[PDB]
Amino acid sequence: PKGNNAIPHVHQKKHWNPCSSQKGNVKVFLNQPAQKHRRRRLRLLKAKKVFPRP
Amino acid sequence: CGSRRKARRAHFQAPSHVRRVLMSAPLSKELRAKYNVRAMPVRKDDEVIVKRGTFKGREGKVTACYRLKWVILIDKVNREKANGSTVAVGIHPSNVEITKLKLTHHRKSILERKDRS
Amino acid sequence: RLSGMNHSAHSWGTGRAVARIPRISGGGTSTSGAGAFGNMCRGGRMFAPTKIFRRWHRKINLHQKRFAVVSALAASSVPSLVMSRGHQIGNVPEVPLVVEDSIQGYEKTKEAMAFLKAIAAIDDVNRVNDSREIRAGRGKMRNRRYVARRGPMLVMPNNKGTRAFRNIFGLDLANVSALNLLHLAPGGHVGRFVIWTQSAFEQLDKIFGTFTEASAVKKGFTLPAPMLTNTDVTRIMQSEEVRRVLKPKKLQTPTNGM
Amino acid sequence: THYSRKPQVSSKSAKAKVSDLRCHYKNTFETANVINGMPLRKAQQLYRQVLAKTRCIPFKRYNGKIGRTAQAKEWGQTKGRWPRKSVVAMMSLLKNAEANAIEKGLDPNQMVIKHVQVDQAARMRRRTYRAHGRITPYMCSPCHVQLFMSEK
RNA sequence: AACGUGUCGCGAUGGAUGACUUGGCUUCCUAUUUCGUUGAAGAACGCAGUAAAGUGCGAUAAGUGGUAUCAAUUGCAGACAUUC
RNA sequence: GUGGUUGGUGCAGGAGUGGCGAAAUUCAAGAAAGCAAACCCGUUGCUGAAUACAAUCAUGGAGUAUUGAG
RNA sequence: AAGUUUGAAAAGCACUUUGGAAAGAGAGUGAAAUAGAACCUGAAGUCGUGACAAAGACAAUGGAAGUACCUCCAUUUCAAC
RNA sequence: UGUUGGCGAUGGAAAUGGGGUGCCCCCACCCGUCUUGAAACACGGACCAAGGAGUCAAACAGACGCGCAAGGGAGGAGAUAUGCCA
RNA sequence: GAUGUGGCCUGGAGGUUAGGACGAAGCUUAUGGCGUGAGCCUAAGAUGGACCGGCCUCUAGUGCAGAUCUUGGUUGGCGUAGCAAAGAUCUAACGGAGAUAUACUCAACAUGCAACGUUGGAUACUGGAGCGGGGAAGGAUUUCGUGCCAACGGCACUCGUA
Ligand SMILES: [Mg+2]
Ligand SMILES: [Mg+2]
Ligand SMILES: [Mg+2]
Ligand SMILES: [Mg+2]
Ligand SMILES: [Mg+2]
Ligand SMILES: [Mg+2]
Ligand SMILES: [Mg+2]
Ligand SMILES: [Mg+2]
Ligand SMILES: [Mg+2]
Ligand SMILES: [Mg+2]
Ligand SMILES: [Mg+2]
Ligand SMILES: [Mg+2]
Ligand SMILES: [Mg+2]
Ligand SMILES: [Mg+2]
Ligand SMILES: [Mg+2]
Ligand SMILES: [Mg+2]
Ligand SMILES: [Mg+2]
Ligand SMILES: [Mg+2]
Ligand SMILES: [Mg+2]
Ligand code: NA
Ligand code: NA
Ligand code: NA
Ligand code: NA
Ligand code: NA
Ligand code: NA
């Protein structure tokens, strides 16, 4: 019995969820710390290579 | 490996030249003092003595290192069958103890390589 | 995403005297005409298959994290709370235990163990050693084969001098510049046993600030003010000022009637 | 490999066994249950006379809608039969037990059957064909038999 | 009486549970990383002293050459170690 | 004066890759089990000598365990 | 569909004897055969067998309260309560 | 709140509670379902094992727990402990 | 229909406290004790042979009697319904473990039945649009000899397209 709620506009009516029939359309961030580590390592190597230039 | 699955798979699918190293035995106090080496891979025609099991205390010469059943065979270690014929019993190399080495040129090279001094 | 659903099953309808569930198509095998596509069917699909966009991680307010670290540090200086958590501190000289800074020059584990025996942390180290065993349950199939208790933690001012202590089983090493709540309160229980080096002990005030002066590291952070000035309420309850106003004490089968 | 019961004195007894007979279990049950307390020579005579068809085996548990006969009055029933395939196998079992007793050195003329037990074995499978393209089972039901006899 | 009923001890038929796990699923990373007319992917037929499937190989056919290693391989047979 | 990104001739190091390469008990006991109440006394005291057992008679794995030293 | 998951090791049951054979009865290996070849454990349901209790002219099952017989169960007492 | 007997002298005992099976007197329609109404001549129902159904994400609200408060809090990214450490 | 419970139970994680070859988990019960209950605990195993309990937090693919529920096993009906088109076999001698198989008395019958192959003889059937002799499509070793008889040839076999 919908009481006094807001009127929802959740916007999820396309095939975004991957299931047995759909590939999906999603993006997760589970590689965030690994990629951050990789970026820092690359920057340190590049500084070492181009030394003494800034 | 820090994975039990990977470690056990490597052990049980090891090739022959890896099983040779995996099947090693310690040396006596006399040989340890003489060569400064703690253990060597077992080889045919070595002299060993059994330190564990129901054949503990027996000494003999090695006649085979099967390497497919992970055992060595010793001539004095045997039992009887139903029909009265004799068969050999396999021991694991880490349960025995080398007391005399079959020495060759390459074997002495290996011992010099592994000398800890 | 495709598991349990890799068949071309269809329902047979009614009229045939079988329940209306999708059934595998074809003939010639034992799987022909068997139920498919359902949590109730063998070989079927599970109810609500699990996804990788479940919320695995959590957000915590920075101030609440700092509050928790401060509270665990304060609890690690009351010798009864350490005992309740479970450490063996019966023959320990003092709590907090502060030790000279010359242990950072050790180079052999024999020297490290001699120092531990002199300080009398060896009782807790032995507790940890004797507790080691093989875990119960399925966990030992999943790279979690051994379990043991938690021993003392030794805090150093930097990352130098740990070579002698690194291999001792049952001793943990910490850096004062980055203290971890998961180590200061294992299991969620406060009262870890901590051995302080003198330099780290003198760095504590600059790292955490005081009740009036702010921290030089955690920008604009001061220790939280207490809700009670004196936490002993039984003394207040029994004091003379309260007893003068307490209310005075007072002094304290047939039924028929005919 | 032990039996469900043991003899009182094990030096004056003999044993025999069959595992998967390939005789009908329901027929061998009746054929073997009738000799439970009899002397060995009496049991052998009864089996010979059943083969000659002058006596019968009483059917007591598995007798649903079988015929009535006048040779069943001896056992207090009205229904009995003459199963030759089971009779000729119980004869072999008795011969084996007698040989065992003779080897142990006992007198076969003094032995009395004391234990008989018949049980169902695993079942083999064939098939039959019915109307409208149906296929339906056609199974074989074999038996285990065990017995021992003691000297009187 | 017989048949049937009920309880207990022993035995069958059956293949659950527990313990085990060289398997699956999921998530990350590294790089001198991307097939074919110089005939690929796929498909067929063969090859061992003994050899059906599988694995490996191609009339040089359970493999030839080179390096390294060092004494086996094994169901049964058969036959340079300073490394043929 | 410069160019190893014009071509031809030579010969160096490093990285990467593959091989080799470390310590310390098969230590002692065949009840090989306990107790002495947070710590210490205790590197010390005192507890059996066993045979039980099995609905007259016979029968009964491997020490990575225990305990103490190192 | 389908774990070859016997056992530490094949030590995988020589020999006697009954049977056409499959097998049975002994003997033996092994800590165990109640570990005998697809052989760890070995449930429920169903069946055989021995002993026992009664009674099927109120379908059985069920409740409440007694009694007869049994009880590899527990607790208490034994010369002072 | 005392008093008088019986049984019980260390047993294969006595006693008191449980448990099992039979018997007597009394009581007592077959479960689940939909329905105003089921013991129904209303549907499902031979036995056992293992499996089998309110879950994950996202927007909003109310109640309750915690931190700070005219302020509260990120996110993405960086820096160095750090090169076991997602 | 709502709510509460220092309310019960299952797989895993962080802590803490413990157990096990002088026997862990699992399994069995006329094994009692405790709890209003969900349940917990002890006993015995003449069962088993290597792991695992309590408490405080955290977490989820977390509790079954029924869905013409899904998979595997079992079961009464039941030694029952049936195994009735295509006419049909008999006899002797060989072969075979398939017999002429006894506690004795006893000549023998009334206490070893039933069924099998080859050869000879007898009696029938097919009846030239044939249970004759050759081929295509389809099949692919079913062909032949020697053995064997566990399963298969809906009865049987000493025989077989096995
Ligand atoms: Mg409404
Ligand atoms: Mg309303
Ligand atoms: Mg699909
Ligand atoms: Mg280390
Ligand atoms: Mg009839
Ligand atoms: Mg038909
Ligand atoms: Mg048809
Ligand atoms: Mg009667
Ligand atoms: Mg078994
Ligand atoms: Mg789970
Ligand atoms: Mg019962
Ligand atoms: Mg579920
Ligand atoms: Mg009939
Ligand atoms: Mg007929
Ligand atoms: Mg008909
Ligand atoms: Mg004619
Ligand atoms: Mg005509
Ligand atoms: Mg047939
Ligand atoms: Mg032939
Ligand atoms: Na599945
Ligand atoms: Na020793
Ligand atoms: Na409903
Ligand atoms: Na109803
Ligand atoms: Na169930
Ligand atoms: Na006919």
PDB file of N, CA and C (backbone and C1' of nucleotides) and ligand atoms in Angstrom, chain C residues 142, chain I residues 11-12 60-62, ligand 10:
ATOM      1  N   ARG C 142      42.389 -24.887   2.260  1.00  0.00           N
ATOM      2  CA  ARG C 142      42.362 -23.620   1.548  1.00  0.00           C
ATOM      3  C   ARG C 142      43.485 -22.689   1.977  1.00  0.00           C
TER       4      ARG C 142
ATOM      5  P     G I  11      28.485 -27.527  11.193  1.00  0.00           P
ATOM      6  O5'   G I  11      29.141 -26.787   9.947  1.00  0.00           O
ATOM      7  C5'   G I  11      29.293 -27.434   8.692  1.00  0.00           C
ATOM      8  C4'   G I  11      29.566 -26.452   7.578  1.00  0.00           C
ATOM      9  C3'   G I  11      30.760 -25.536   7.749  1.00  0.00           C
ATOM     10  O3'   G I  11      31.995 -26.165   7.465  1.00  0.00           O
ATOM     11  C1'   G I  11      28.924 -24.283   6.977  1.00  0.00           C
ATOM     12  P     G I  12      33.307 -25.842   8.326  1.00  0.00           P
ATOM     13  O5'   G I  12      33.606 -24.306   8.069  1.00  0.00           O
ATOM     14  C5'   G I  12      34.658 -23.881   7.214  1.00  0.00           C
ATOM     15  C4'   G I  12      34.499 -22.437   6.796  1.00  0.00           C
ATOM     16  C3'   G I  12      35.293 -21.415   7.585  1.00  0.00           C
ATOM     17  O3'   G I  12      36.648 -21.321   7.192  1.00  0.00           O
ATOM     18  C1'   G I  12      33.081 -20.657   7.329  1.00  0.00           C
ATOM     19  P     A I  60      26.475 -11.876   5.130  1.00  0.00           P
ATOM     20  O5'   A I  60      26.354 -13.307   4.457  1.00  0.00           O
ATOM     21  C5'   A I  60      27.267 -13.737   3.455  1.00  0.00           C
ATOM     22  C4'   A I  60      27.183 -15.222   3.208  1.00  0.00           C
ATOM     23  C3'   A I  60      25.887 -15.715   2.582  1.00  0.00           C
ATOM     24  O3'   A I  60      26.168 -16.812   1.717  1.00  0.00           O
ATOM     25  C1'   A I  60      26.213 -16.784   4.655  1.00  0.00           C
ATOM     26  P     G I  61      26.226 -16.621   0.128  1.00  0.00           P
ATOM     27  O5'   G I  61      25.268 -17.749  -0.433  1.00  0.00           O
ATOM     28  C5'   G I  61      23.862 -17.676  -0.249  1.00  0.00           C
ATOM     29  C4'   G I  61      23.208 -19.022  -0.403  1.00  0.00           C
ATOM     30  C3'   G I  61      23.417 -19.987   0.754  1.00  0.00           C
ATOM     31  O3'   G I  61      22.290 -20.854   0.856  1.00  0.00           O
ATOM     32  C1'   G I  61      24.358 -20.896  -1.199  1.00  0.00           C
ATOM     33  P     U I  62      21.119 -20.622   1.921  1.00  0.00           P
ATOM     34  O5'   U I  62      21.736 -21.091   3.302  1.00  0.00           O
ATOM     35  C5'   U I  62      21.907 -22.461   3.606  1.00  0.00           C
ATOM     36  C4'   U I  62      21.765 -22.734   5.079  1.00  0.00           C
ATOM     37  C3'   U I  62      20.383 -22.562   5.671  1.00  0.00           C
ATOM     38  O3'   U I  62      19.577 -23.696   5.447  1.00  0.00           O
ATOM     39  C1'   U I  62      22.006 -21.599   7.095  1.00  0.00           C
TER      40        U I  62
HETATM   41 MG    MG J  10      28.860 -22.791   2.268  1.00  0.00          MG
END
